[PDB]
Design an enzyme around this catalytic site. Structure first.
Site, PDB file in Angstrom:
ATOM      1  N   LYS A  90      -7.878  -0.963   4.914  1.00 41.55           N
ATOM      2  CA  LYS A  90      -8.063  -0.048   4.628  1.00 41.55           C
ATOM      3  C   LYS A  90      -7.140   1.212   3.287  1.00 41.55           C
ATOM      4  O   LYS A  90      -7.094   2.311   2.970  1.00 41.55           O
ATOM      5  CB  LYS A  90      -6.027  -0.210   5.346  1.00 41.55           C
ATOM      6  CG  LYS A  90      -6.090  -0.099   6.920  1.00 41.55           C
ATOM      7  CD  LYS A  90      -5.009  -0.352   7.817  1.00 41.55           C
ATOM      8  CE  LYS A  90      -4.863  -0.245   8.890  1.00 41.55           C
ATOM      9  NZ  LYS A  90      -5.786  -0.664   9.691  1.00 41.55           N
ATOM     10  N   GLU A 104       1.334   8.253   9.457  1.00 40.89           N
ATOM     11  CA  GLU A 104       1.141   7.040  10.651  1.00 40.89           C
ATOM     12  C   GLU A 104       0.900   5.480  10.732  1.00 40.89           C
ATOM     13  O   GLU A 104       0.186   5.147  10.462  1.00 40.89           O
ATOM     14  CB  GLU A 104       1.329   7.982  11.840  1.00 40.89           C
ATOM     15  CG  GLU A 104       0.068   7.414  12.516  1.00 40.89           C
ATOM     16  CD  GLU A 104      -1.253   7.356  11.308  1.00 40.89           C
ATOM     17  OE1 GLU A 104      -1.426   8.270  10.596  1.00 40.89           O
ATOM     18  OE2 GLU A 104      -2.659   6.985  11.557  1.00 40.89           O
ATOM     19  N   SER A 120     -12.932  -7.383   7.934  1.00 49.51           N
ATOM     20  CA  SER A 120     -11.504  -6.362   7.605  1.00 49.51           C
ATOM     21  C   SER A 120     -10.451  -6.820   7.149  1.00 49.51           C
ATOM     22  O   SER A 120     -10.046  -6.368   6.156  1.00 49.51           O
ATOM     23  CB  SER A 120     -11.077  -5.425   9.049  1.00 49.51           C
ATOM     24  OG  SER A 120     -11.432  -6.236  10.036  1.00 49.51           O
TER      25      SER A 120
END
Ligand SMILES: *Cc1c(COP(=O)(O)O)cnc(C)c1O
Ligand SMILES: *Cc1c(COP(=O)(O)O)cnc(C)c1O
Ligand code: NA
Ligand code: NA
Lengths: 251, 392, 392, 251
Positions: free
Chosen positions: C86, C108, C376
């Site tokens: 991310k 969010e 990830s």
């Protein structure tokens, strides 16, 4: 003094080995400890190996570690141990008294000062558990200057070079943990005392037959102590039985 | 006899029971051999790069220094696999154990970081790892304990003594003196008996080598000073090493000041302890006037080693390196400051180093200076600790 | 009108209230401009390299594949600053916001990872970040919540609806429709209204570009298949992107199967949902026969997006990519396996991808295949979760 | 049908603006909702804008969100809403009835089918909150095929191009949120209804003076409802007062 020299000479003229018990000074308490030691001696101990409670005995097993814990619980300090050492010598003039120490306690206020204090109270030898022969120069030198015998451990994984160093550096007796014994005598090493696992009469006789001058009970004595904590009197009784049994086996 | 000098000035040596000397000698020799073995170096470099994620970045922190003539860079060991610098040396020690034909690893840990590192290394290189940890530390480090077990390591509690790092260190040595034939004791810091202080430095020196090249690339000159926290001394020496010969480069080690030096509740033995002989070495210790070894206190669990590496004590004595202390509150503030202005959560251990750099900056805002702080690890683990404090 | 195609086949589009179109248009345009701006690319690359720690390593996992003809590599995004992939795209979006002259960021988050990433990016680039998070998610993510606040972000609970990720997504849009002049909505996945799906892919494609070069360097050929978990679709598309034109390279996306597809308790809308129009896009959704949007269930909190990126739905429809599902238990096992055999603690999200690779290997032990799993993120956050389960 | 066309023509001949209230179908319950709507009409509502409870009304504020929550609590579904729509039309033949929908609910079972259902129950218009003019083709086309007026929102940040699209694409009325009004009339856009903030009589007269054909109370009606939940009767009373007050201001 020459307490070890005299002891071994006397034992040789009587064709017997020496039995040496170990205990932690102040365990489980000063008074009980002084009584234990006098009991060990009256039962037939030939010499003593006394340990001073240290915070991190990285060279001791469970049994002894608990002995230090018990000793610390009673507030035992090195200074008190030395007060005990003095009281013990005053009552017993010829029994060899060896101390099992940890380096920091010896180095703490000056290595030389430590050995000066040993000599003053009547100590005969000192074995610094965490000082290998390679780092012993300062220690054995200080010990010699104060007529203290620097004791060294001869491990099983020892080689010829180590045997030679232990033989010329050590005094009083060699702390041994057939070939090793013969070699130590070949190099005129101090009389060897079999240690580790020594907890039964037959082990004492076996050590003497192998050519050792005696045996050292590294923790058996401590074990008897911790099992009879609730009964100080029964403790002294069992200690007296075990020691006379062990001593008898050296004759 | 030995191959390398076991002493740094008067500090160091090999103060272990005779029975352990052969283990130390064998270890030194395998190390000397491995350091000359190109194959060993290639394999070590490969793991550091493709497994651990080296080289780590060198981050310039502009927001932190705004309004001052201080330029600050952070060596990002917090980005290393495992979240701390400890991973570098455990990888090398494991290869060393394998080179010696050993299949088992023995390790000691307090805060748990070294335990986790030893475990991950062992798992990766197929070694049966057993870790000794103080009972008090187990209770306090449930997370790291489950991580070690999760990685197949056997966690063994140590209830003897004060049940902390020093007590764990003793149990490890005990185990090793009897099993060094098949087991290798993976000590966790630049301390203990020779050759450990020397070996850990060499397996952590890539920190300083990378930092030099990186600062040389971005600034075209060496930093005016490199700053690192000092618990045992591994991340600090790792950063220092390659700069030692660069006289113009200041080396600053930071010991935990705890609640304050004058309170006696700290963990700064190098500047506020007394030389003694423990854990197989001659070095400054946290001890009573009597000679009993005491515990090292700090808000950060990882700076609990009640002593310090021999080489640091030496580097200090000759004046080559300077050592100072930072309190819990100063570390906390540095911790909060980095989160807010750079978006990096530092380990409370590393926060001590940052805090000192912040002080160097703040006290003399107009002094031009190029500083590098070794961010030894991430502080995700310290989130709750910093929480309850700011909450209470 | 628009500059880029808002659709991938029949999926995607810009289904937002009229009032928000100008914001989307402005955003697309700034993006098109930034993608041609060498200065922008240099600044983005600089942050990725010197701040985030790129490029990330590609780890070969030999212990895991022993005894099989499968060669497995893991793209280490778990080593990226923040512990997850991310971070890549939030860094680019923040620079985009700055390019547009915006000083505020709106985000969010459900599991909290995106919230933490947005917060760290904002802190680093001097942006006032306010994050919307579902009340149920706040209670469950106390750690990440304190991390965001610790980094200066304002955390705003969302009690409306089911109080989860989807409800948080609505409150953000509401806020943005009224403040997009000074604030930028930093969406957290390759979904939502155009240009977000396109923008997030481009800001995550370095994952695949690095992987190609790295596998090319170590194996001399492209992998037979790249595998990634699919929550919203950002890490998966990031890995896929650069391989799309390489027809010989299989692309496998893994949706969470939860307690099992047949139980209805899962989070695999792409293969087990129904196309609908929500969150500004036409894509497969988790919804009732009535058309009400339902929640996505999975042991891993991060795969809670009740929908999926438009491009994945498209890539699936043309047969270019294949999507499968992995259950909680399969993910748990993959999680335990990686810890024990490679010394890497994977995020439970990433564990779904690994689990599938393990199945490809195990079912056909003698099949020769070169696989790459996109790890990830790290699983330090999932330690307790995996604990209580194995304990219960 | 041409309900909006007829209404506006009738309002123009009486030189007055239209007042249109919005409410969520099924809030707080089916029965109470049907009573509310009949009260809104008897109080003077010129047309209605009804919303269907949706799980994620990403285009609504707090007030309306709670209305959906209340509606869902009573188990209100789209199918029930359509049952209500039918009952409402049967009782009131000429009042324009517009629905405020969310895209998924319209697309769910086929866009065309949705508008076919609207026509069958007597709905006059549909405004899909999350479908901008750029994505409306399928919707407005389906709406036209079933004689439903596709309503579009003309935001404040709108530009000339948007005004032109809204003007040719919309029917019934333009949902407006001086220049904008004149321009909409220039492009022959459906009569404009001022929305947002409409909650007091003076706002209605202000809208009509600006050139708008009326006003829409986007949430005031909903507010009165949530404040009188404990008293269904007092709720209808206040709703009747507010609506007659608002309507009077349009004359
Ligand atoms: C363990 C640790 C330290 C302390 O160890 P040294 O040997 O003093 O480096 C410092 N920083 C971090 C992040 C640690 O985990
Ligand atoms: C957030 C997250 C995901 C899910 O997001 P995508 O947009 O589907 O990538 C996957 N893995 C990790 C580690 C995450 O934190
Ligand atoms: Na220390
Ligand atoms: Na999804």
């Amino acid at each position: 003094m020459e307490r070890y020299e005299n002891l071994f000479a006397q034992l040789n003229d009587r064709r017997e080995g020496a039995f040496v018990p170990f205990v932690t000074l102040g365990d489980p308490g000063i008074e009980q400890s002084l009584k234990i030691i006098d009991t060990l001696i009256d039962a037939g101990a030939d010499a003593l190996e006394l340990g001073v409670p240290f915070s991190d005995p990285l060279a001791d097993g469970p049994t002894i570690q608990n002995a230090n814990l018990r000793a610390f619980a009673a507030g035992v300090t090195p200074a008190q141990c030395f007060e005990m050492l003095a009281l013990i010598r005053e009552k017993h003039p010829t029994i060899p008294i060896g101390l099992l120490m940890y380096a920091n306690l010896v180095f703490n206020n000056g290595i030389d000062a430590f050995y000066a204090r040993c000599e003053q109270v009547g100590v005969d030898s000192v074995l610094v558990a965490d000082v290998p022969v390679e780092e012993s120069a300062p220690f054995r030198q200080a010990a010699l200057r104060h007529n203290i015998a620097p004791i060294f451990i001869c491990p099983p994984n020892a080689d010829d070079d180590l045997l030679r160093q232990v033989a010329s550096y050590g005094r009083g007796y060699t702390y041994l943990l057939h070939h090793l014994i013969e070699k130590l005598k070949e190099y005129h090493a101090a009389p060897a005392l079999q240690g580790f696992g020594i907890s039964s009469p037959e082990q004492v006789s076996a050590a003497v037959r192998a050519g050792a001058a005696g045996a050292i009970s590294g923790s058996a004595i401590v074990k008897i102590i911790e099992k009879n904590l609730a009964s100080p009197k029964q403790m002294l009784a069992e200690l007296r039985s075990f020691v006379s049994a062990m001593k008898a086996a050296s004759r | 006899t030995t191959l390398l000098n076991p002493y740094f000035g008067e500090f160091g040596g090999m103060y272990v029971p005779q029975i352990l000397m052969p283990a130390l000698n064998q270890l030194e020799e395998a190390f000397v051999s491995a350091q000359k073995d190109p194959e060993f170096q290639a394999q070590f470099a490969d793991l550091l790069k493709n497994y651990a994620g080296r080289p780590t970045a060198l981050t310039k922190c502009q927001n932190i220094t705004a309004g001052t003539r201080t330029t600050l860079y952070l060596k990002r060991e917090d980005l290393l696999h495992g979240g701390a610098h400890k991973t570098n040396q455990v990888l090398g020690q494991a290869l060393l154990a394998k080179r010696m034909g050993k299949s088992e690893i023995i390790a000691e840990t307090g805060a748990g970081q070294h335990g986790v590192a030893s475990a991950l290394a062992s798992a990766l290189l197929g070694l049966k790892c057993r870790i000794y940890m103080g009972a008090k530390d187990v209770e306090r480090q449930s997370p790291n304990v489950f991580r070690m077990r999760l990685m197949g390591a056997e966690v063994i509690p140590v209830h003897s003594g004060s049940a902390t790092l020093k007590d764990a260190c003793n149990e490890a040595l005990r185990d090793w003196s009897g099993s060094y034939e098949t087991a290798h004791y993976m000590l966790g810091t630049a301390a203990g008996p020779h050759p450990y202080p020397t070996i850990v430095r060499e397996f952590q020196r890539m920190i300083g080598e990378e930092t030099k090249a990186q600062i040389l690339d971005k600034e075209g000159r060496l930093p005016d000073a490199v700053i690192a926290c000092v618990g045992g001394g591994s991340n600090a020496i790792g950063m220092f090493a390659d700069f030692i010969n660069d006289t113009s480069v200041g080396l600053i080690g930071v010991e935990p000041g705890g609640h304050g030096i004058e309170t006696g509740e700290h963990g700064a033995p190098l500047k506020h302890g007394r030389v003694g002989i423990y854990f197989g070495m001659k070095a400054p210790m946290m001890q009573t006037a009597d000679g009993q070894i005491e515990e090292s206190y700090s808000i950060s669990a990882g700076l609990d080693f009640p002593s310090v590496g021999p080489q640091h004590a030496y580097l200090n004595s000759i004046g080559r390196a300077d050592y100072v202390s930072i309190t819990d509150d100063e570390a906390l503030e540095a911790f909060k400051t980095l989160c807010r202005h750079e978006g990096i959560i530092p380990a409370l251990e590393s926060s001590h180093a940052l805090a000192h750099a912040l002080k160097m900056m703040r006290e003399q805002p107009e002094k031009e200076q190029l500083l590098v702080v070794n961010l030894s690890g991430r502080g995700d683990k310290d989130i709750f600790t910093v929480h309850d404090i700011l909450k209470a």
